[PDB]
């Protein structure tokens, strides 16, 4: 059933639900999350493999990412602690790599390294 003349109260319930679901800085958080989650794995998985006398393959794939850690022994840096020590609130970045190569005489190897 329709809501005539009650719409002042009803017009703001939807606004309150909108600002509960979504904060005021959602366009920043969503953009950065989409960057981390898709654009980093897109920039790295479409860079051509490098080669160079025999030559190699050296392909990258499957990036990883961790939580902000400082080190001392590794520990999570809280943003207030990074704010007080003039640190940089950041997270390290790791990726998989394969150093495949083949040479004259029909000899080859396919060594690899995870989470470089």
């Amino acid at each position: 059933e329709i809501t005539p003349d009650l719409w002042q109260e009803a017009c703001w319930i939807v606004i309150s639900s909108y600002f509960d679901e979504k904060g005021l800085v959602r366009q920043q958080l969503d953009s950065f999350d989409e960057f981390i989650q898709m654009s980093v794995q897109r920039i790295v998985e479409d860079a051509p493999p490098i080669d160079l006398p025999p030559r190699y393959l050296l392909k990258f794939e499957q990036i990883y990412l961790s939580k902000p850690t400082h080190w001392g022994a590794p520990s999570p840096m809280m943003p207030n602690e990074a704010r007080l020590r003039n640190l940089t609130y950041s997270a390290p970045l790791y990726v998989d790599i394969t150093k495949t190569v083949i040479k004259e005489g029909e000899e080859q190897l396919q060594t690899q390294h995870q989470k470089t």
């Binding site: 366009q27 920043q28 953009s31 950065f32 989409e34 960057f35 654009s39 980093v40 920039i43 790295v44 860079a47 490098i50 160079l52 006398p53 030559r55 190699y56 050296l58 950041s90 970045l93 790599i97 150093k99 390294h113 470089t116």
Partner: protein
Amino acid sequence: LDLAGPLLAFLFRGMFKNLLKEVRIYAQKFIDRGKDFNLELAIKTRIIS
């Protein structure tokens, strides 16, 4: 509107091309000697970071 997503994806492309140039030169300096080259010392961590 370019938010923190495309603004940073624009940096990351150049900063990932630079380190591939660095691994290129580090493999070049090591295969020409006839020895074998190691990528661990070729990946310059200080390009992205």
